[PDB]
Amino acid sequence: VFLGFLGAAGSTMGAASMTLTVQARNLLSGLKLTVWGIKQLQARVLAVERYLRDQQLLGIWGCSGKLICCTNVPWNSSWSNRNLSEIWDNMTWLQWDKEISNYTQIIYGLLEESQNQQEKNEQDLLALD
Amino acid sequence: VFLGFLGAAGSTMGAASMTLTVQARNLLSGLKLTVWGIKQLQARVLAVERYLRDQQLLGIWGCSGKLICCTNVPWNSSWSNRNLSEIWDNMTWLQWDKEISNYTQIIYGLLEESQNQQEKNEQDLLALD
Amino acid sequence: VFLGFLGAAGSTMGAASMTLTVQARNLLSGLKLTVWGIKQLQARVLAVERYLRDQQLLGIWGCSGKLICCTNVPWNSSWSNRNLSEIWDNMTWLQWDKEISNYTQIIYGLLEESQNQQEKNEQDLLALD
Amino acid sequence: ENLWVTVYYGVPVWKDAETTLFCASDAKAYETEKHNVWATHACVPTDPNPQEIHLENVTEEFNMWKNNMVEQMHTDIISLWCQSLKPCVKLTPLCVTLQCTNVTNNITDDMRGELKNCSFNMTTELRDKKQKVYSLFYRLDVVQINNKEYRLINCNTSAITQACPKVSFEPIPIHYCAPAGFAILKCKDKKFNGTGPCPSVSTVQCTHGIKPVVSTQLLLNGSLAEEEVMIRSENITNNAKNILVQFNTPVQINCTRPNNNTRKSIRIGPGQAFYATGDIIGDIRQAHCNVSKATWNETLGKVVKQLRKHFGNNTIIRFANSSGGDLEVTTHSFNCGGEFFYCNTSGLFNSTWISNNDSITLPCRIKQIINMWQGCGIGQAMYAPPIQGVIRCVSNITGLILTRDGGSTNSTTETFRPGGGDMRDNWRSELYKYKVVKIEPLGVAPTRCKRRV
Amino acid sequence: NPQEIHLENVTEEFNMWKNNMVEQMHTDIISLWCQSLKPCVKLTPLCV
Ligand SMILES: *[C@@H]1O[C@H](CO)[C@@H](O[C@@H]2O[C@H](CO)[C@@H](O[C@@H]3O[C@H](CO[C@H]4O[C@H](CO)[C@@H](O)[C@H](O)[C@@H]4O)[C@@H](O)[C@H](O[C@H]4O[C@H](CO)[C@@H](O)[C@H](O)[C@@H]4O[C@H]4O[C@H](CO)[C@@H](O)[C@H](O)[C@@H]4O)[C@@H]3O)[C@H](O)[C@H]2NC(C)=O)[C@H](O)[C@H]1NC(C)=O
Ligand SMILES: *[C@@H]1O[C@H](CO)[C@@H](O[C@@H]2O[C@H](CO)[C@@H](O[C@@H]3O[C@H](CO[C@H]4O[C@H](CO)[C@@H](O)[C@H](O)[C@@H]4O)[C@@H](O)[C@H](O[C@H]4O[C@H](CO)[C@@H](O)[C@H](O)[C@@H]4O)[C@@H]3O)[C@H](O)[C@H]2NC(C)=O)[C@H](O)[C@H]1NC(C)=O
Ligand SMILES: *[C@@H]1O[C@H](CO)[C@@H](O[C@@H]2O[C@H](CO)[C@@H](O[C@@H]3O[C@H](CO)[C@@H](O)[C@H](O[C@H]4O[C@H](CO)[C@@H](O)[C@H](O)[C@@H]4O)[C@@H]3O)[C@H](O)[C@H]2NC(C)=O)[C@H](O)[C@H]1NC(C)=O
Ligand SMILES: *[C@@H]1O[C@H](CO)[C@@H](O[C@@H]2O[C@H](CO)[C@@H](O[C@@H]3O[C@H](CO)[C@@H](O)[C@H](O)[C@@H]3O)[C@H](O)[C@H]2NC(C)=O)[C@H](O)[C@H]1NC(C)=O
Ligand SMILES: *[C@@H]1O[C@H](CO)[C@@H](O[C@@H]2O[C@H](CO)[C@@H](O[C@@H]3O[C@H](CO)[C@@H](O)[C@H](O)[C@@H]3O)[C@H](O)[C@H]2NC(C)=O)[C@H](O)[C@H]1NC(C)=O
Ligand SMILES: *[C@@H]1O[C@H](CO)[C@@H](O[C@@H]2O[C@H](CO)[C@@H](O[C@@H]3O[C@H](CO)[C@@H](O)[C@H](O)[C@@H]3O)[C@H](O)[C@H]2NC(C)=O)[C@H](O)[C@H]1NC(C)=O
Ligand SMILES: *[C@@H]1O[C@H](CO)[C@@H](O[C@@H]2O[C@H](CO)[C@@H](O)[C@H](O)[C@H]2NC(C)=O)[C@H](O)[C@H]1NC(C)=O
Ligand SMILES: *[C@@H]1O[C@H](CO)[C@@H](O[C@@H]2O[C@H](CO)[C@@H](O)[C@H](O)[C@H]2NC(C)=O)[C@H](O)[C@H]1NC(C)=O
Ligand SMILES: *[C@@H]1O[C@H](CO)[C@@H](O[C@@H]2O[C@H](CO)[C@@H](O)[C@H](O)[C@H]2NC(C)=O)[C@H](O)[C@H]1NC(C)=O
Ligand SMILES: *[C@@H]1O[C@H](CO)[C@@H](O[C@@H]2O[C@H](CO)[C@@H](O)[C@H](O)[C@H]2NC(C)=O)[C@H](O)[C@H]1NC(C)=O
Ligand SMILES: *[C@@H]1O[C@H](CO)[C@@H](O[C@@H]2O[C@H](CO)[C@@H](O)[C@H](O)[C@H]2NC(C)=O)[C@H](O)[C@H]1NC(C)=O
Ligand SMILES: *[C@@H]1O[C@H](CO)[C@@H](O[C@@H]2O[C@H](CO)[C@@H](O)[C@H](O)[C@H]2NC(C)=O)[C@H](O)[C@H]1NC(C)=O
Ligand SMILES: *[C@@H]1O[C@H](CO)[C@@H](O[C@@H]2O[C@H](CO)[C@@H](O)[C@H](O)[C@H]2NC(C)=O)[C@H](O)[C@H]1NC(C)=O
Ligand SMILES: *[C@@H]1O[C@H](CO)[C@@H](O[C@@H]2O[C@H](CO)[C@@H](O)[C@H](O)[C@H]2NC(C)=O)[C@H](O)[C@H]1NC(C)=O
Ligand SMILES: *[C@@H]1O[C@H](CO)[C@@H](O)[C@H](O)[C@H]1NC(C)=O
Ligand SMILES: *[C@@H]1O[C@H](CO)[C@@H](O)[C@H](O)[C@H]1NC(C)=O
Ligand SMILES: *[C@@H]1O[C@H](CO)[C@@H](O)[C@H](O)[C@H]1NC(C)=O
Ligand SMILES: *[C@@H]1O[C@H](CO)[C@@H](O)[C@H](O)[C@H]1NC(C)=O
Ligand SMILES: *[C@@H]1O[C@H](CO)[C@@H](O)[C@H](O)[C@H]1NC(C)=O
Ligand SMILES: *[C@@H]1O[C@H](CO)[C@@H](O)[C@H](O)[C@H]1NC(C)=O
Ligand SMILES: *[C@@H]1O[C@H](CO)[C@@H](O)[C@H](O)[C@H]1NC(C)=O
């Protein structure tokens, strides 16, 4: 089905993992001398800033695929102590971010490191052949 | 040769498939209190909107390569009923879009589905190893 | 360590090749009727133009990985006549660009050609299977 | 043999659309300014080496009469005219009762006093003591009201502001450009009436230098046609539709203002200062415009030979002058050295052509208070300051704006008279060979190629 | 918390007398001086 934009906002993370191509679709874009022109323009640039803020992180991380992705960073237990079948079938994305909001910035540091490290490491395999 | 920007606009789709890196090059970018400043600015942002409109579709589809690409969607005959050597050697891109303008939006739905479906499917292969 | 933004600006190219994920991080983003609003806005759009100018070249070249990359273009000796262990351990990036500023545009032509050529060539391998 | 869709990014695919175009002018235009350029303040320097790509095998259909780059240009020119006179000195404490007389001259009785030596009061720097000062005005600027006492013609229509003397009204070349994702297609056909397919089309980023020349009856310093003279019309049969003529060879014209005027610098306020017309140094002479009658001879012959291609071959073509109305329509309204001329074109369009060394001088009047383009609202009126010295200017006549009479089934001949009023035509005479297109580079095509899993 | 990164081994050549952030600052201050007095009371009916 197509529940639409943000359809699975109250659904389990496993059920909302099906609707990631819909929320990404409507995330960018669906006049004389006045005050509404700027009213729309500064919003129309904030849209772009809010999009590329995410995209540059998605790029400097290992995954420019822009949908879903796995990474070579061990899930540090200290972050949640919850179970695979107890979050993907018993918790909502908002609730989840509510738990992990504290450590989000930390994780971003580790992803940037792991990715730069992987790319530097792969150049050495490409250079010997 | 380098026929330049839009050189192969009257050429067959097979002959214009050689000049895709040229039209993509010149597709982004080649003052006091006035009215020309905004005149240029709103155009200079429409450039970016018109570029990223295409790029987000190219990303949510299977191909962020940004040049040419194949997809796992069967070409539904009902769309054209024309032949491989009768379009790539006997039809111009404009004429072609003139035929397929009706179904373009439909195809985009199918590409988004196929891609989200492929990525979800590949995570399951990556998780068992 | 994290020497910070532009930490390795006076360091050898080999030592600065470790800090490429830091300079890329701080390269995008770290009000009533007035004159500062536009003062910030035209700068806030020049940021985006200066970013995507680089990104479109990085895309039309073979490497959208956005970190480091190798290419199938032979290093034409006529450009430098210097040695691998005499630039990566005895020269700074600025000095290096100071040498190669003359030929930079030439190299960009060759990269665009090689990439369009590779992609056209790979479609023929994908079509026979 | 089972086909697969394949995405393509960068396909020559465009569609007709309308965007916000910007200006572009040479680096010299930015050079010649004492705040003197009326536009170039914030214009983009033009590319030193413009590039024009010829698109082979392409046939695109143009339509000059419903083209939007014209509307953008005109409304932009209107807004620029407006904005250039906002911060300039306003002549509100004018319109005082003017005690006027003839100018000092003894000529026969068949000479109506074009100029009037007027006297009036004025407010000085202080808002107490007045100022019995005199000026010289043209008769068109003033109107009697019931010793002859007058007023300014516009006191009863709109407010008034003076055009600063620092700014100039010199038409400079404007190249219009389109943003990324768009392009401007330029028909490269020698004989093209602006509507229909163009066999040899090319593309460009910025058009050629289009000078914004404001005239009404005759197009000036325009682009010459190629080979045979060009006729363009939206509907030739409809006598209500103008007929724009573009010339192949330019007709030399010479307009002069033989009056060495004087600039009086009155102080109306603590900041403002008004520029009246002082006494005339020399003879009381009239502004006039010259047209070499030989070149005009051959030009009229070459246009009638093109007319016969549309109105039957063995017919008689007559030329008469304007019918009447405003001065802006019945005279070749234009600006030269800053003064706004209004010339009588009755000596150019009084001819008759059957199936088969001097100058024609034209009496040119001058007006200083003009209110074209409605006045930016319902208020502003502009006073063209007086210009010292004799003004002489040489221009090209490069086109005409004609109109035909509605005889219906009257004769084998039909008479043609100058027209205008709507100045968008002045731009359609140069934006007949251009059109805008947006780029949509996403195109999918079938091929027996699938990406593996 | 402003951050100042010391760039070791770097030697850059400055020129204070042909520096443009100065021109921007002054012309901006001029324009601000200007704009702050536009909507303020004008004393035209003074000078008596
Ligand atoms: C169709 O095309 C024709 C051909 O181009 C065009 O003719 C142009 O006519 C105008 C109007 O007369 C000419 O412009 C004036 O030229 C005179 C003198 O000519 C040159 O003299 C010196 C060298 O001898 C040159 O360096 C100079 O630049 C001139 O080109 C000038 O006196 C005029 O300049 C004054 O006015 C300018 C703006 O109006 C100011 O920017 C300039 O600083 C001058 O200001 C002075 O003027 C006041 C007196 O007038 C004086 O009191 C002030 O203190 C101040 O010092 C002006 O440039 C032009 O040369 C002709 N064309 C060309 C190519 O030169 C037609 O006009 C055109 N059709 C239409 C409708 O315009
Ligand atoms: C448009 O209309 C205006 C109306 O004001 C005319 O302006 C006046 O014109 C008259 C002449 O037409 C000018 O009068 C002349 O003034 C000269 C200056 O002398 C006076 O000034 C000095 C100080 O500078 C005093 O000390 C002295 O006592 C004088 O009072 C005189 O020298 C002139 O004399 C000559 O003409 C008169 C005319 O009757 C003769 O009797 C004399 O013998 C002699 O031949 C003359 O009186 C007056 O100055 C003008 N106004 C101003 C403000 O200057 C414009 O001339 C008119 N323009 C046109 C084109 O018609
Ligand atoms: C001041 O203004 C007055 C006008 O009020 C002006 O006086 C006029 O001079 C002309 C001279 O050209 C007079 O015209 C003459 O009229 C008679 C008939 O009345 C004609 O026969 C004359 O013929 C001559 O001109 C013909 C063509 O021009 C020639 O073919 C012929 O052979 C003659 O040469 C002549 O035209 C006019 O009558 C007077 N006006 C009055 C009211 O007397 C005077 O010249 C001006 N002076 C200055 C200094 O400005
Ligand atoms: C895209 O789809 C539309 C339908 O949604 C297609 O429009 C249809 O086109 C046919 C012609 O191919 C039209 O038939 C016309 O009938 C009139 C009636 O007499 C006749 O005068 C015409 O000569 C023509 O035969 C049909 O009416 C029209 N559909 C509708 C609803 O108007 C369109 O052709 C498709 N585009 C392409 C490129 O195939
Ligand atoms: C980039 O390419 C340009 C050429 O397009 C190089 O410029 C050239 O540099 C040499 C020096 O290496 C110049 O020689 C000079 O000759 C004068 C004449 O006496 C002398 O006084 C100087 O000491 C110097 O020897 C040469 O003139 C100059 N070319 C031109 C056309 O001016 C430039 O060096 C290249 N950049 C790099 C980093 O190599
Ligand atoms: C009045 O019209 C004449 C037309 O002959 C103008 O002189 C001519 O100006 C045109 C350009 O406006 C010149 O054509 C150009 O010549 C160059 C030469 O290299 C050519 O490469 C260009 O493609 C273009 O065709 C033309 O040569 C010139 N005629 C002569 C005899 O020099 C004159 O400037 C006009 N005056 C105005 C508009 O005030
Ligand atoms: C404005 O100019 C007129 C004449 O053009 C002056 O009119 C005078 O008005 C007074 C009114 O009391 C009469 O008594 C005079 O007879 C008028 N004529 C004169 C004085 O020549 C008027 O005074 C002028 N305004 C001023 C000087 O402020
Ligand atoms: C504004 O002034 C103009 C000219 O003084 C007026 O136009 C003239 O009006 C009178 C009387 O209404 C007519 O006799 C004239 O024929 C008109 N002139 C022309 C050229 O048509 C105009 O009516 C005035 N507007 C007002 C007073 O509202
Ligand atoms: C430009 O010239 C062409 C050719 O003369 C005109 O094409 C005519 O178009 C009408 C209807 O659009 C047809 O009925 C005629 O048969 C066409 N002429 C020919 C010779 O086939 C076109 O109308 C002209 N356009 C303008 C604006 O003058
Ligand atoms: C028009 O009148 C002006 C009046 O100022 C003349 O300018 C003066 O001309 C004389 C002789 O030509 C010079 O001696 C003066 O120096 C000039 N005045 C100034 C302020 O410089 C001007 O010459 C007249 N027009 C012509 C074509 O001569
Ligand atoms: C228009 O003006 C131009 C220049 O003022 C005239 O051209 C010159 O005119 C002078 C005097 O008439 C001659 O001595 C020159 O030989 C002319 N040169 C050229 C290149 O023509 C032109 O003749 C005038 N034409 C008209 C119709 O007034
Ligand atoms: C066009 O020419 C005609 C005929 O020469 C002019 O008609 C004359 O106009 C004047 C001014 O109104 C009248 O006094 C005459 O009675 C008119 N003559 C006729 C026979 O009607 C007409 O003025 C000219 N057009 C222009 C705009 O000047
Ligand atoms: C434009 O030219 C025509 C034609 O010369 C002028 O009409 C003349 O008007 C005067 C009256 O001032 C008559 O004496 C002439 O006999 C008229 N000419 C003809 C041929 O009849 C007209 O006045 C001029 N100006 C305008 C504004 O129309
Ligand atoms: C067209 O212009 C010619 C040229 O002036 C006019 O011819 C004049 O006709 C009158 C008749 O009343 C003669 O008295 C003049 O001598 C003629 N002038 C010349 C120079 O020959 C002609 O009148 C104009 N057209 C019309 C319809 O009047
Ligand atoms: C991750 O968990 C380990 C347990 O070995 C703990 O020592 C460490 O501090 C945690 N890391 C971070 C960055 O919180
Ligand atoms: C594709 O073609 C099939 C033929 O089996 C047809 O049934 C179907 O409606 C077409 N699909 C679409 C979405 O047009
Ligand atoms: C690269 O070096 C070769 C040496 O064989 C030289 O001939 C060639 O001109 C160089 N190419 C360019 C584009 O500079
Ligand atoms: C102006 O001159 C004309 C003709 O010379 C005359 O009829 C009129 O009465 C004069 N008017 C004045 C105010 O001098
Ligand atoms: C053009 O003129 C003809 C003449 O009869 C008229 O019938 C038609 O309505 C006009 N408009 C057009 C052709 O668009
Ligand atoms: C010049 O124009 C007049 C006006 O009708 C005409 O009589 C004459 O024949 C023309 N000259 C030539 C050489 O055709
Ligand atoms: C008029 O006749 C000429 C020959 O004198 C011919 O070339 C032209 O085509 C004809 N024009 C028509 C009939 O419109």
PDB file of N, CA and C and ligand atoms in Angstrom, chain D residues 101-105 116-119 132-136 264 278-280 284, ligand 2:
ATOM      1  N   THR D 101       5.186  85.787 -20.897  1.00  0.00           N
ATOM      2  CA  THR D 101       5.151  86.643 -22.073  1.00  0.00           C
ATOM      3  C   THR D 101       5.861  85.922 -23.210  1.00  0.00           C
ATOM      4  N   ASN D 102       5.772  86.492 -24.408  1.00  0.00           N
ATOM      5  CA  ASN D 102       6.553  85.975 -25.519  1.00  0.00           C
ATOM      6  C   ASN D 102       8.042  86.162 -25.238  1.00  0.00           C
ATOM      7  N   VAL D 103       8.861  85.407 -25.965  1.00  0.00           N
ATOM      8  CA  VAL D 103      10.304  85.599 -25.902  1.00  0.00           C
ATOM      9  C   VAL D 103      10.692  86.810 -26.747  1.00  0.00           C
ATOM     10  N   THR D 104      11.861  87.375 -26.448  1.00  0.00           N
ATOM     11  CA  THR D 104      12.323  88.570 -27.143  1.00  0.00           C
ATOM     12  C   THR D 104      12.628  88.267 -28.604  1.00  0.00           C
ATOM     13  N   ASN D 105      11.658  88.482 -29.489  1.00  0.00           N
ATOM     14  CA  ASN D 105      11.872  88.220 -30.903  1.00  0.00           C
ATOM     15  C   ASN D 105      10.838  88.976 -31.723  1.00  0.00           C
ATOM     16  N   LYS D 116       7.986  80.744 -23.951  1.00  0.00           N
ATOM     17  CA  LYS D 116       7.368  81.767 -23.119  1.00  0.00           C
ATOM     18  C   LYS D 116       8.331  82.165 -22.013  1.00  0.00           C
ATOM     19  N   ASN D 117       8.606  83.461 -21.913  1.00  0.00           N
ATOM     20  CA  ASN D 117       9.433  84.003 -20.838  1.00  0.00           C
ATOM     21  C   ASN D 117       8.535  84.213 -19.627  1.00  0.00           C
ATOM     22  N   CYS D 118       8.651  83.326 -18.645  1.00  0.00           N
ATOM     23  CA  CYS D 118       7.751  83.310 -17.505  1.00  0.00           C
ATOM     24  C   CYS D 118       8.454  83.801 -16.248  1.00  0.00           C
ATOM     25  N   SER D 119       7.672  84.433 -15.380  1.00  0.00           N
ATOM     26  CA  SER D 119       8.134  84.894 -14.082  1.00  0.00           C
ATOM     27  C   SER D 119       7.172  84.382 -13.020  1.00  0.00           C
ATOM     28  N   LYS D 132      11.169  86.064  -6.516  1.00  0.00           N
ATOM     29  CA  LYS D 132      10.663  86.468  -7.826  1.00  0.00           C
ATOM     30  C   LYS D 132      11.723  86.122  -8.863  1.00  0.00           C
ATOM     31  N   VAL D 133      11.651  84.900  -9.384  1.00  0.00           N
ATOM     32  CA  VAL D 133      12.610  84.413 -10.364  1.00  0.00           C
ATOM     33  C   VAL D 133      11.865  84.092 -11.654  1.00  0.00           C
ATOM     34  N   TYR D 134      12.611  84.091 -12.756  1.00  0.00           N
ATOM     35  CA  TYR D 134      12.053  83.865 -14.080  1.00  0.00           C
ATOM     36  C   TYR D 134      12.677  82.628 -14.709  1.00  0.00           C
ATOM     37  N   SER D 135      11.928  82.015 -15.625  1.00  0.00           N
ATOM     38  CA  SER D 135      12.385  80.854 -16.371  1.00  0.00           C
ATOM     39  C   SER D 135      11.851  80.955 -17.793  1.00  0.00           C
ATOM     40  N   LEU D 136      12.263  80.009 -18.635  1.00  0.00           N
ATOM     41  CA  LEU D 136      11.806  79.929 -20.016  1.00  0.00           C
ATOM     42  C   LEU D 136      11.246  78.537 -20.255  1.00  0.00           C
ATOM     43  N   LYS D 264      19.682  77.872 -15.388  1.00  0.00           N
ATOM     44  CA  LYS D 264      19.523  78.666 -14.177  1.00  0.00           C
ATOM     45  C   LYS D 264      19.394  77.729 -12.983  1.00  0.00           C
ATOM     46  N   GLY D 278      17.522  79.349 -18.671  1.00  0.00           N
ATOM     47  CA  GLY D 278      17.865  80.757 -18.716  1.00  0.00           C
ATOM     48  C   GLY D 278      17.689  81.343 -20.100  1.00  0.00           C
ATOM     49  N   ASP D 279      18.339  82.474 -20.370  1.00  0.00           N
ATOM     50  CA  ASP D 279      18.193  83.121 -21.663  1.00  0.00           C
ATOM     51  C   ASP D 279      18.912  82.326 -22.750  1.00  0.00           C
ATOM     52  N   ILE D 280      18.456  82.513 -23.984  1.00  0.00           N
ATOM     53  CA  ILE D 280      19.031  81.838 -25.142  1.00  0.00           C
ATOM     54  C   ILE D 280      20.175  82.682 -25.685  1.00  0.00           C
ATOM     55  N   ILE D 284      16.782  82.476 -32.360  1.00  0.00           N
ATOM     56  CA  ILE D 284      15.582  81.706 -32.058  1.00  0.00           C
ATOM     57  C   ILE D 284      15.329  80.756 -33.219  1.00  0.00           C
TER      58      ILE D 284
HETATM   59  C1  LIG F   2      12.862  87.355 -19.722  1.00  0.00           C
HETATM   60  O1  LIG F   2      12.198  88.225 -18.802  1.00  0.00           O
HETATM   61  C2  LIG F   2      13.049  88.718 -17.756  1.00  0.00           C
HETATM   62  C3  LIG F   2      12.175  89.545 -16.842  1.00  0.00           C
HETATM   63  O2  LIG F   2      12.866  89.914 -15.656  1.00  0.00           O
HETATM   64  C4  LIG F   2      14.218  89.507 -18.346  1.00  0.00           C
HETATM   65  O3  LIG F   2      15.124  89.823 -17.295  1.00  0.00           O
HETATM   66  C5  LIG F   2      15.551  91.209 -17.242  1.00  0.00           C
HETATM   67  O4  LIG F   2      15.834  91.826 -18.513  1.00  0.00           O
HETATM   68  C6  LIG F   2      16.268  93.193 -18.397  1.00  0.00           C
HETATM   69  C7  LIG F   2      16.492  93.700 -19.803  1.00  0.00           C
HETATM   70  O5  LIG F   2      15.641  93.051 -20.738  1.00  0.00           O
HETATM   71  C8  LIG F   2      17.521  93.306 -17.519  1.00  0.00           C
HETATM   72  O6  LIG F   2      17.780  94.685 -17.274  1.00  0.00           O
HETATM   73  C9  LIG F   2      19.149  95.073 -17.532  1.00  0.00           C
HETATM   74  O7  LIG F   2      19.914  95.199 -16.327  1.00  0.00           O
HETATM   75  C10 LIG F   2      21.285  95.656 -16.512  1.00  0.00           C
HETATM   76  C11 LIG F   2      21.997  95.663 -15.146  1.00  0.00           C
HETATM   77  O8  LIG F   2      21.906  96.969 -14.546  1.00  0.00           O
HETATM   78  C12 LIG F   2      21.264  96.869 -13.248  1.00  0.00           C
HETATM   79  O9  LIG F   2      22.038  96.052 -12.329  1.00  0.00           O
HETATM   80  C13 LIG F   2      23.117  96.682 -11.598  1.00  0.00           C
HETATM   81  C14 LIG F   2      23.738  95.620 -10.708  1.00  0.00           C
HETATM   82  O10 LIG F   2      24.110  94.517 -11.528  1.00  0.00           O
HETATM   83  C15 LIG F   2      22.553  97.852 -10.812  1.00  0.00           C
HETATM   84  O11 LIG F   2      23.566  98.399  -9.976  1.00  0.00           O
HETATM   85  C16 LIG F   2      22.071  98.901 -11.803  1.00  0.00           C
HETATM   86  O12 LIG F   2      21.635 100.065 -11.106  1.00  0.00           O
HETATM   87  C17 LIG F   2      20.967  98.345 -12.718  1.00  0.00           C
HETATM   88  O13 LIG F   2      19.777  98.378 -11.933  1.00  0.00           O
HETATM   89  C18 LIG F   2      21.262  97.039 -17.188  1.00  0.00           C
HETATM   90  O14 LIG F   2      22.592  97.471 -17.432  1.00  0.00           O
HETATM   91  C19 LIG F   2      20.486  96.978 -18.511  1.00  0.00           C
HETATM   92  O15 LIG F   2      20.442  98.284 -19.087  1.00  0.00           O
HETATM   93  C20 LIG F   2      20.279  98.225 -20.520  1.00  0.00           C
HETATM   94  O16 LIG F   2      18.929  97.999 -20.859  1.00  0.00           O
HETATM   95  C21 LIG F   2      17.998  98.994 -20.368  1.00  0.00           C
HETATM   96  C22 LIG F   2      16.602  98.556 -20.786  1.00  0.00           C
HETATM   97  O17 LIG F   2      15.685  99.594 -20.453  1.00  0.00           O
HETATM   98  C23 LIG F   2      18.395 100.381 -20.916  1.00  0.00           C
HETATM   99  O18 LIG F   2      17.549 101.371 -20.350  1.00  0.00           O
HETATM  100  C24 LIG F   2      19.868 100.682 -20.566  1.00  0.00           C
HETATM  101  O19 LIG F   2      20.254 101.962 -21.063  1.00  0.00           O
HETATM  102  C25 LIG F   2      20.772  99.569 -21.084  1.00  0.00           C
HETATM  103  O20 LIG F   2      20.664  99.617 -22.512  1.00  0.00           O
HETATM  104  C26 LIG F   2      19.086  96.408 -18.298  1.00  0.00           C
HETATM  105  O21 LIG F   2      18.371  97.376 -17.543  1.00  0.00           O
HETATM  106  C27 LIG F   2      17.329  92.595 -16.185  1.00  0.00           C
HETATM  107  O22 LIG F   2      18.564  92.549 -15.481  1.00  0.00           O
HETATM  108  C28 LIG F   2      16.818  91.178 -16.405  1.00  0.00           C
HETATM  109  N1  LIG F   2      16.593  90.504 -15.137  1.00  0.00           N
HETATM  110  C29 LIG F   2      17.587  90.077 -14.352  1.00  0.00           C
HETATM  111  C30 LIG F   2      17.176  89.391 -13.086  1.00  0.00           C
HETATM  112  O23 LIG F   2      18.766  90.241 -14.650  1.00  0.00           O
HETATM  113  C31 LIG F   2      14.958  88.670 -19.381  1.00  0.00           C
HETATM  114  O24 LIG F   2      15.950  89.458 -20.027  1.00  0.00           O
HETATM  115  C32 LIG F   2      13.988  88.113 -20.416  1.00  0.00           C
HETATM  116  N2  LIG F   2      14.691  87.264 -21.363  1.00  0.00           N
HETATM  117  C33 LIG F   2      14.491  87.318 -22.684  1.00  0.00           C
HETATM  118  C34 LIG F   2      15.313  86.377 -23.512  1.00  0.00           C
HETATM  119  O25 LIG F   2      13.681  88.089 -23.189  1.00  0.00           O
END
